[PDB]
Enzyme design. Structure first.
Site, PDB file in Angstrom:
ATOM      1  N   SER A  44      91.212  -5.973 -77.673  1.00 38.91           N
ATOM      2  CA  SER A  44      91.701  -4.544 -77.424  1.00 38.91           C
ATOM      3  C   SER A  44      92.754  -3.995 -77.911  1.00 38.91           C
ATOM      4  O   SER A  44      93.139  -2.812 -77.773  1.00 38.91           O
ATOM      5  CB  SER A  44      91.543  -4.246 -75.910  1.00 38.91           C
ATOM      6  OG  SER A  44      90.110  -4.284 -75.524  1.00 38.91           O
ATOM      7  N   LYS A  47      93.582  -0.696 -79.705  1.00 39.05           N
ATOM      8  CA  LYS A  47      93.685   0.596 -79.385  1.00 39.05           C
ATOM      9  C   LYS A  47      95.007   1.328 -79.106  1.00 39.05           C
ATOM     10  O   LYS A  47      95.091   2.456 -79.427  1.00 39.05           O
ATOM     11  CB  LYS A  47      92.972   0.513 -77.709  1.00 39.05           C
ATOM     12  CG  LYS A  47      91.537  -0.006 -77.780  1.00 39.05           C
ATOM     13  CD  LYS A  47      90.969  -0.267 -76.374  1.00 39.05           C
ATOM     14  CE  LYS A  47      89.574  -0.697 -76.469  1.00 39.05           C
ATOM     15  NZ  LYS A  47      89.210  -1.429 -75.305  1.00 39.05           N
ATOM     16  N   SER A 104      92.493   0.393 -71.615  1.00 37.91           N
ATOM     17  CA  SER A 104      91.488  -0.406 -72.401  1.00 37.91           C
ATOM     18  C   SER A 104      90.231  -0.049 -72.332  1.00 37.91           C
ATOM     19  O   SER A 104      89.187  -0.581 -72.286  1.00 37.91           O
ATOM     20  CB  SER A 104      91.800  -1.592 -72.397  1.00 37.91           C
ATOM     21  OG  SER A 104      91.366  -2.586 -73.262  1.00 37.91           O
ATOM     22  N   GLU A 142      81.288  -5.542 -80.173  1.00 33.91           N
ATOM     23  CA  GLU A 142      81.346  -6.314 -81.340  1.00 33.91           C
ATOM     24  C   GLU A 142      82.427  -6.994 -81.906  1.00 33.91           C
ATOM     25  O   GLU A 142      82.501  -8.174 -82.231  1.00 33.91           O
ATOM     26  CB  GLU A 142      80.258  -5.948 -82.325  1.00 33.91           C
ATOM     27  CG  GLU A 142      78.775  -5.625 -82.080  1.00 33.91           C
ATOM     28  CD  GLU A 142      78.586  -4.501 -80.974  1.00 33.91           C
ATOM     29  OE1 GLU A 142      79.315  -3.363 -81.240  1.00 33.91           O
ATOM     30  OE2 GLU A 142      77.886  -4.640 -79.843  1.00 33.91           O
TER      31      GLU A 142
HETATM   32  C1  8YF Z   1      85.685  -6.245 -72.153  1.00 32.51           C
HETATM   33  C2  8YF Z   1      86.655  -6.239 -73.394  1.00 32.51           C
HETATM   34  O1  8YF Z   1      86.180  -4.706 -74.040  1.00 32.51           O
HETATM   35  C3  8YF Z   1      88.189  -6.425 -73.319  1.00 32.51           C
HETATM   36  C4  8YF Z   1      88.583  -6.551 -74.625  1.00 32.51           C
HETATM   37  O2  8YF Z   1      87.873  -6.436 -75.733  1.00 32.51           O
HETATM   38  O3  8YF Z   1      89.812  -6.770 -75.006  1.00 32.51           O
HETATM   39  C5  8YF Z   1      88.749  -5.193 -72.772  1.00 32.51           C
HETATM   40  C6  8YF Z   1      88.996  -4.952 -71.098  1.00 32.51           C
HETATM   41  C7  8YF Z   1      89.983  -5.549 -70.839  1.00 32.51           C
HETATM   42  S1  8YF Z   1      90.273  -6.585 -69.292  1.00 32.51           S
HETATM   43  C8  8YF Z   1      91.663  -5.620 -68.410  1.00 32.51           C
HETATM   44  C9  8YF Z   1      91.757  -6.549 -66.984  1.00 32.51           C
HETATM   45  N1  8YF Z   1      93.186  -6.383 -66.681  1.00 32.51           N
HETATM   46  C10 8YF Z   1      93.538  -6.894 -65.461  1.00 32.51           C
HETATM   47  N2  8YF Z   1      94.880  -6.734 -64.981  1.00 32.51           N
HETATM   48  C11 8YF Z   1      90.664  -5.870 -71.974  1.00 32.51           C
HETATM   49  C12 8YF Z   1      92.203  -6.009 -71.792  1.00 32.51           C
HETATM   50  O4  8YF Z   1      92.804  -6.923 -71.423  1.00 32.51           O
HETATM   51  O5  8YF Z   1      93.064  -5.222 -72.405  1.00 32.51           O
HETATM   52  N3  8YF Z   1      90.426  -5.154 -72.988  1.00 32.51           N
END
Ligand code: 8YF
EC number: 3.5.2.6
Length: 265
Positions: A44, A47, A104, A142
């Site tokens: 992520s 982003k 995210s 993906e």
């Molecule tokens: C599930 C997936 O989209 C994940 C990723 O691809 O990185 C998303 C969901 C999340 S989990 C966030 C949980 N945080 C808890 N403190 C992350 C991230 O850590 O930035 N991005």
């Protein structure tokens, strides 16, 4: 960089994977570099650069950020914690950008990717600020496969750090946009156990996290403002050889500490 080479090698032996760190002191220009040119999955963490790309084009399109975006149930990908709440109403581009950075939000990310011309559009933006390493190839979710050896949807800690410094502190964004970008990162809610955890209370910090989950892959990049010196920019990325290997927020925080100690706290 050599003051921390052996502490880093030990930290990643305890982790059981690989840790890539690049940190730069914007004052002296001192840098600390460990596996900084290796490719790691972005997860992520793209982003943040997504929002910066959106901010950039809001310099050409007035009213972009307040444009309402409407979307259907089919747009709701797993982990869309904000956009699921506005499904029946829609969201502005600025609200989607904030959601992607601070929660995210995956649906918000994919909606914003569409506006920019998809992964090639975001990659095109990164090339325009001088980043030749970054590549985004796929959409959420993906993009998060984190396959060992796969260059898709990866960058290096050093490229990440260098692009972040250009967008947060340099001249890649006009000053209104740059401040907006920094504000979104400062309001991030997902990074409390990563770079922020290596940071004392009285320091300003904005970050963006990434958590593929599989292959012990997670990350965090951040601009840090100590009191009384110049801001520090840094990126911490991890990965591991086995699909079921677990990522570690504590390992990311620990690499952040070592990088700050390496630069002279
Ligand atoms: C599930 C997936 O989209 C994940 C990723 O691809 O990185 C998303 C969901 C999340 S989990 C966030 C949980 N945080 C808890 N403190 C992350 C991230 O850590 O930035 N991005």
């Amino acid at each position: 960089t050599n003051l921390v080479a052996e502490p880093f090698a030990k930290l990643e032996q305890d982790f059981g994977g690989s840790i890539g760190v690049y940190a730069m002191d914007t004052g002296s220009g001192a840098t600390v570099s460990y596996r900084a040119e290796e490719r790691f999955p972005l997860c992520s963490s793209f982003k943040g650069f997504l929002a910066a790309a959106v901010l950039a084009r809001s310099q050409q399109q007035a009213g972009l950020l307040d444009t309402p975006i409407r979307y259907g149930k089919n747009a709701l990908v797993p982990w869309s914690p904000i956009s699921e709440k506005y499904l029946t109403t829609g969201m502005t581009v600025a609200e989607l950008s904030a959601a992607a950075v601070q929660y995210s939000d995956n649906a918000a990310a994919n909606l914003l990717l569409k506006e920019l011309g998809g992964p090639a559009g975001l990659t095109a933006f990164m090339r325009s600020i001088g980043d030749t390493t970054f590549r985004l190839d796929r959409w959420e979710l993906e993009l998060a496969s984190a396959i060992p050896g796969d260059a898709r949807d990866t960058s290096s800690p050093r490229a990440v750090t260098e692009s972040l410094q250009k967008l947060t502190l340099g001249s890649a964004l006009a000053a209104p946009q740059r401040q907006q970008f920094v504000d979104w990162l400062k309001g991030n809610t997902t990074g409390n156990h990563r770079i922020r955890a290596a940071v004392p209370a009285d320091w300003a910090v904005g970050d963006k996290t990434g958590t593929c989950g599989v292959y012990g892959t997670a990350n965090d990049y951040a601009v840090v403002w100590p009191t009384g010196r110049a801001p520090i920019v840094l990126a911490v990325y991890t990965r591991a050889p086995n699909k079921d290997d677990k990522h570690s927020e504590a390992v990311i925080a620990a690499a952040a500490r070592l990088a700050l100690e390496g630069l002279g706290v």
